[PDB]
Scaffold this active site. Structure first.
Site, PDB file in Angstrom:
ATOM      1  N   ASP A   1       0.521  -0.972  -0.066  1.00  0.00           N
ATOM      2  CA  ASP A   1       0.032  -0.194  -0.256  1.00  0.00           C
ATOM      3  C   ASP A   1       0.434   1.287   0.082  1.00  0.00           C
ATOM      4  O   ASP A   1       0.180   2.453  -0.056  1.00  0.00           O
ATOM      5  CB  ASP A   1      -0.685   0.322   1.323  1.00  0.00           C
ATOM      6  CG  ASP A   1      -1.682  -0.667   1.288  1.00  0.00           C
ATOM      7  OD1 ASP A   1      -2.510  -0.990   2.389  1.00  0.00           O
ATOM      8  OD2 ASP A   1      -2.511  -1.435   0.020  1.00  0.00           O
TER       9      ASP A   1
HETATM   10  O1  LIG Z   1      -4.821   2.106   4.525  1.00  0.00           O
HETATM   11  C1  LIG Z   1      -4.003   0.283   5.373  1.00  0.00           C
HETATM   12  C2  LIG Z   1      -2.333   1.291   5.362  1.00  0.00           C
HETATM   13  O2  LIG Z   1      -1.842   2.309   5.466  1.00  0.00           O
HETATM   14  C3  LIG Z   1      -1.245   2.299   5.611  1.00  0.00           C
HETATM   15  O3  LIG Z   1      -0.317   3.748   6.209  1.00  0.00           O
HETATM   16  C4  LIG Z   1       0.374   1.294   6.203  1.00  0.00           C
HETATM   17  O4  LIG Z   1       1.548   1.754   5.526  1.00  0.00           O
HETATM   18  C5  LIG Z   1      -0.230   0.185   5.439  1.00  0.00           C
HETATM   19  O5  LIG Z   1       0.652  -1.682   5.983  1.00  0.00           O
HETATM   20  C6  LIG Z   1      -1.787   0.534   5.151  1.00  0.00           C
HETATM   21  O6  LIG Z   1      -2.319  -1.489   5.124  1.00  0.00           O
HETATM   22  K   LIG Z   2      -0.513  -5.376   1.717  1.00  0.00           K
END
Ligand SMILES: OC[C@H]1O[C@@H](O)[C@H](O)[C@@H](O)[C@@H]1O
Ligand SMILES: [K+]
Ligand SMILES: OC[C@H]1O[C@@H](O)[C@H](O)[C@@H](O)[C@@H]1O
Ligand SMILES: [K+]
Lengths: 822, 822
Positions: free
Chosen positions: A490
């Protein structure tokens, strides 16, 4: 250093001190009603959706952590204590918490009274039941008053925490001291208006007193540990009007030496049809009929015990599909009990609500729920089938999908971003896992809408075609899939270039254009695109299948030609076509996701584990050398030490945390499976051990979080906190490690037409037996395993040798006895 | 029953116990940096925007309330206490908090050590400064160690409270024990990435030790009242990595009997240019230049005292524009100090951030900021001019507007709904008030964009035309303005019809069609449309003004032909065309808003107060009899006892709270002003006293909230909590009561070309003098007031009779002496 131990026979983790490194929780409930319960009774309960129908209030980032939950204050002689230790923190003579499958028990004793509470969600019920046993362990008669306590939440958890300007005036309760089974309090905020639901907090005795106003029970200027009412020894009989509704009863108890008494408390979620909401013509009094019914279902100890036994038997049945008996008790308890229990929890919760996920922004993830099915389809395939239809209904006609859906409504939303280009293929992965497990080919004909739109239904197979063609029709100049907002990682946001704070990288608007491509999605496409082709072949679609395998061939060739850095796979090309995850850069040289996934997909695999020339071997050696640590494999190396504008969120973490140098556990099992593919069982198993709960129990003081479940992240070597976990329970790591160990290490894995038996675990497990129920038959799979490097199994079935490693599925009611030699 | 007292000479409220019915706060700052500071040092600080730049963390709905703030733990020979009482709650020998204009002092004494802290935000600084004086009041030497403490927020308050899965890994700090003026801690979360700002917490001495990790300072299982470090008596020198950063320094002090020592602490907000962000070529060390400068500006007690005196003179100057000397000391303290101070706060904060408003969803309101300008334009007209341009820039080309804008960016959003049809007229109200006050006609020529679009600029006058025409072009079947989502009463949602919970009535999609009309907006248009017609004529637009006067006359006739129920004005027509606020219905028979506003607009006004046949008099008499309570006037009567689906949010509040039978204070001064219009000064002044802080101080235990500021709502007679307020400080009640008392009761009110002098306050105030500075001249207005009903003033000016009640504005540097006989 340990704070507890596993009890395999009881399928429990036993916590032997209140003083753990962090609150350690269990989840109660497996159907539609859930509770988070810590070993100090902390947490909350909700029906279907933690954001929208949260019954009880829980403060994240409290001081101290986890002060608040389901308390029973004991007043004995003016001394007040709680058996959960928090919030009063009185010295206990004895304390123990056991977290089991769908129930926990917490016991505290002080000054000759032992109070044990069983907490559970009964099958088929939207209620948390507590059975409390108080025992006089002294040699003289005792008396005490017990004060129950729970703090209600005003249903919508976001409004509860931010909209006091409205909500301090809306709190409403009713009090029923003399009900049919005992005393009950009704929390009915907004039942006056749009809610057809209320909560009850009741006890199976006529209580001496009650309180519904938090401020009166606790007292001005006091924390929960200093609550006024229990210290005075008498309830204030407060009736809340706005402010902060609670449920609290007092019960006077008297006990002869050695005598005990059971009390049964129930927190329940009730609905009424609109036509029957009210008991009175003026519409001021809630219709208590469903609450009276629920309370009569748990009016006695025998009812509680019977339901606890039905729950125990339900777990035994669920766990009867896959089990192992080996020389390694750590491996066995993970495969047999904990990893499967955790897969249930992730199936139900997705990434929504834990002691780290706050049950507000996050619903049921498209990617997350597909990864969760991988480890869930053997447990309850009917529920897996339904989840596939729910997920697929949130897909759009072009094959892209909402990233997540609201659990209460099953409608997609963009609340944590949109356009994550790995999402469409994950649907193929979940359906193929489901079909291999169940043989339910008919799921492919199920009518399924796009974005829940009436009249838009097409068969589920056609949704898979949309997913497949989305990647085919969205490749970049190297023939690799365009990444869009991010892929599985992500934080790899290549169309972002944000220099202004204020909006999350996950939701901020992205820029159009560019040529950003993902090697990860390329590998995912080669792996799951091959599955889609097989599904088309089985449906007789020879032109669709032939074309599909051609595209799969093109993308595989594109990965070898344009995704290969020399000693490992590239990670991506950025918006301007510059490579990411190349040794030509000083930081982020090697990233784990394409090494694991490309090799799982067969890309670069040569003659054997000692083919030095094969790209898969070079990639895995690089992983081992550059990402390997004693706590698992870090996501990339070196971590980024300054913000890289073109890469989005990933370099905004300090080195060694989350996606910037953290051990991101969900990606470890891909490397474990990759190592079994190339034929390095011993290496695959070593990596499994580094991250697996039962093996890390001995460093409980380093890991910090629950020693019985996987966490999303362990801090990597670049972090001053190296070894310490965050974000336990809710992670794809649970399903994908279950996959890795049950299907690739131990080697028992369903295919479309038979059961593959392909152990690849190395010499540390020299013999073991798997019992596997598949397609209505039980396979007893006995493995003698030399662990010789690269050696793979030969099989004899019911005494006759067979060719190859696939046992054609046997008709139902068979016991099939497979003898395995590796 | 009282918890303190006013100190008029010091312009302070003095709170003489920690044990108030609720935390009582002050606001520090008047410019761009603000702190919410309770009498127990609770609260937080932010730069410009409480949602997006919150420096320090505060928990709403904490147990107990307001445990968390700027603490100074004293360890004296092992005994630990805080002079703020909370959070330790050790018994204090003496305690006092004084809230003043822009500063507060809190003093606590225990066992021979007195610790006094002055808190303030200095002029021109983005910092909160604390000057702490420790005095040995005993007869022997004392040694003590002082531990300062503040808990940082991770800037984005919404993220801070919900996004732990990310933000527990990002907290970062730097520690500088040996800085140029003493020791400092830097909180620099996300400075690595998109943020160009960081916070400093520093003391003007080289500290013995420091802490930046909360969990190390406070200790596992501990609350702030039990914090480990102060109990141990030495700092742990913790360096945070993730989790919860804090600022804390320790200083050991040794004092002879009678000796005192001063320590100066600063919490500051710093920015660096992008090019100068870093001290070092590697971009790893923040550039501390602006923090070193700031700390140097407050390195001595003398510098603090100078800034405190400059802040005192700044407030003397602000308060020199309007003042009153009468025989009523309660009246005079409200007019001369507290109501003007509150209007500064509402100007700055809108409805964003208080101990009830959470500084998350609410930014600067279009309606709210226009109402606040009414009571602020005389204080700092240059800032009010700028605010008008900011508000008008968030208006759309058709005259409708965003309902609020984000304070940091000044851009509008729909986060609390859109299409409130009273909004566009409020802009006319704010601009008319400003021009009347300042004579700055040239503001109408200022170029102002629509929705902040570069290139879309039209003169501000053309924005008022778009406002005016939106009402003209959106009237219903009776000639009354269509209501849209709601009018001023946000809970009157006639286009909603929601039967499903889950989304706030403020944001939920509304239904197209229907005929729902507002009598309030009709009145609002008569009142402010008349100002628009005046502005048009003064701009030389004769035909536009003639058309405007005609539309005003149409809507005025429509109020009497279709908006009159018999004994009071109707409230609205619902979506079906049925009347709302009629004696024909059992509940909600009479609503306060159109009685006050229609009569302010002159509608129904007859021959005098004793004209029992005038509709205005009938309406005001029905208000008195049906809505009047000892705590003020309720919004409507009877309150709704069941949910009325066609009326939206209003019937969802239990009877007597908020918009359903609560005393909604912003509407009371409309009735006060209406009563002066009809010539009933005595009844007008009576209503002013029922709700006004100085008059309610004697029932502080009933009111509960701050006794020196207006609150949005007092619970009404239908509530069990009758008389208890919620939502203090941030309310349009402050501006409108200031308008009511200064301009209508005392009677001194700017018009376009002269100052109206028209006292209407009844016999309880028989003589007073107003000193008013207007258009650069000072008016000394000496009033002899019989208070006989319907008696109106005659004036003489500088010894000579004048006609009527308007004194043409004198040239600057006049003292104009007006003698007023009523
Ligand atoms: O929205 C969820 C995503 O937020 C990000 O800030 C995190 O690094 C990710 O690990 C998470 O999956
Ligand atoms: K992920
Ligand atoms: O969005 C703000 C509005 O929220 C409603 O729930 C309240 O009743 C209003 O008083 C408030 O102005
Ligand atoms: K309002």
């Amino acid at each position: 250093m340990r704070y507890g131990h596993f009890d395999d026979a009881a399928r429990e983790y036993v916590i032997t001190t209140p003083h753990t490194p962090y609150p350690w929780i269990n989840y109660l409930g497996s159907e539609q009603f859930f509770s988070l319960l810590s070993h100090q009774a902390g947490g909350y309960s909700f029906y279907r959706d933690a954001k929208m129908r949260r019954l009880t209030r829980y403060r994240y980032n409290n001081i101290p952590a986890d002060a608040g939950g389901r308390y029973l204050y004991v007043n004995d002689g003016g001394d007040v204590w709680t058996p959960s230790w928090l919030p009063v923190k009185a010295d206990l003579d004895h304390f123990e918490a056991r977290h089991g499958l769908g129930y926990s028990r917490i016991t505290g004793e002080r000054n000759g009274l032992k109070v044990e509470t069983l907490f559970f969600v009964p099958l088929g019920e939207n209620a948390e039941v507590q059975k409390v046993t108080v025992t006089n362990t002294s040699d003289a008669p005792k008396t005490a008053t017990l004060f129950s306590f729970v703090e209600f939440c005003l249903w919508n958890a976001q409004d509860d925490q931010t909209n006091y300007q409205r909500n301090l005036s809306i709190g409403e309760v009713e009090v029923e001291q003399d009900g049919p089974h005992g005393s009950a309090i009704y929390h009915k905020t907004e039942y006056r208006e749009r809610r057809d639901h209320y909560a009850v907090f009741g006890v199976n005795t006529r209580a001496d007193g009650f309180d519904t106003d938090r401020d009166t029970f606790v007292g001005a200027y006091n924390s929960l540990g200093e609550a006024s009412v229990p210290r005075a020894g008498k309830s204030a009989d407060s009736v809340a009007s706005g402010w902060y509704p609670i449920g609290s009863h007092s019960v006077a108890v008297t006990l002869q030496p050695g005598e005990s008494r059971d009390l049964v408390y129930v927190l329940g979620y009730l609905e009424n049809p609109d036509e029957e909401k009210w008991a009175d013509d003026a519409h001021q009094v809630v219709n208590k009929a469903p609450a009276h019914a629920l309370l009569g279902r748990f009016a006695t100890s025998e009812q509680v015990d019977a339901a606890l036994e039905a729950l125990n038997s339900y777990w035994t049945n669920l766990l009867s599909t896959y089990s192992v008996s080996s020389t390694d008790e750590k491996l066995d308890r993970m495969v047999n009990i904990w990893n499967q229990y955790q897969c249930m929890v992730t199936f139900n919760m997705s990434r929504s609500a834990s002691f780290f996920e706050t049950g507000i922004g996050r619903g049921m993830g498209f990617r997350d729920s597909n990864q969760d099915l991988l480890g869930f389809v053997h447990l309850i395939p009917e529920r897996a089938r339904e989840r596939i239809i729910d997920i697929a209904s949130t897909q759009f006609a072009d094959g892209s999908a909402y990233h997540q859906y609201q659990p209460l409504t099953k409608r997609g939303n963009n609340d944590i971003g949109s356009g994550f280009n790995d999402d469409p293929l994950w649907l193929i992965a979940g359906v193929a896992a489901y079909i291999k497990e169940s043989g339910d080919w008919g799921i492919l004909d199920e009518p399924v809408p796009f974005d829940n739109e009436p009249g838009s239904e097409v068969p589920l197979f056609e949704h898979l075609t949309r997913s497949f063609q989305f990647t085919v029709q969205n490749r970049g100049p190297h023939g690799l899939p365009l990444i869009g907002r991010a892929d599985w990682n992500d934080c790899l946001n290549l169309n972002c270039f944000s220099t202004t704070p204020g909006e999350s990288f996950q939701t901020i608007e992205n820029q159009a254009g560019g040529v950003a491509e993902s090697v990860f999605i390329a590998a995912q496409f080669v792996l799951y695109g091959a599955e889609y082709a097989t599904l088309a072949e089985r449906r007789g679609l020879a032109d669709v299948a032939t074309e599909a395998r051609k595209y799969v061939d093109e993308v595989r060739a594109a990965v070898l030609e344009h995704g290969w850095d020399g000693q490992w796979f590239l990670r991506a090309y950025d918006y301007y076509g510059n490579p990411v995850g190349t040794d030509a850069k000083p930081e982020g040289k090697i990233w784990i996701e394409p090494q694991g996934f490309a090799v799982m997909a067969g890309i670069g695999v040569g003659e054997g584990p000692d083919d030095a020339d094969a790209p898969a071997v070079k990639a895995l050696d690089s992983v081992n050398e550059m990402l390997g640590t004693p706590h698992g494999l870090v996501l990339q190396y070196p971590a980024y030490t300054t913000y890289q504008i073109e890469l989005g969120e990933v370099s905004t973490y300090p080195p060694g945390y989350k996606e910037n140098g953290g051990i991101f556990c969900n990606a470890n099992p891909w490397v474990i499976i990759a190592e079994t593919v190339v034929g390095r069982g011993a290496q695959a198993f070593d990596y499994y051990k580094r991250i697996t709960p039962a093996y890390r129990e001995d460093i409980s003081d380093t890991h910090k979080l629950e020693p019985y479940v996987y966490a999303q992240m362990i801090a990597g070597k670049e972090a001053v906190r190296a070894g310490e976990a965050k974000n336990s329970w809710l992670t794809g790591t649970a399903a994908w490690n279950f996959v890795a160990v049950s299907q690739y290490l131990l080697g028992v894995r369903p295919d479309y037409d038979g059961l593959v038996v392909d152990p690849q675990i190395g010499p540390d497990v020299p013999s073991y037996t798997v019992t596997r129920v598949a397609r209505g038959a039980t396979y007893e799979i006995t493995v003698t395993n030399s662990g010789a490097p690269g050696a793979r199994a030969s099989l004899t079935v019911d005494g006759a040798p067979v060719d190859g490693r696939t046992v054609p599925y046997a008709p139902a009611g068979s016991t099939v006895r497979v003898e395995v030699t590796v």
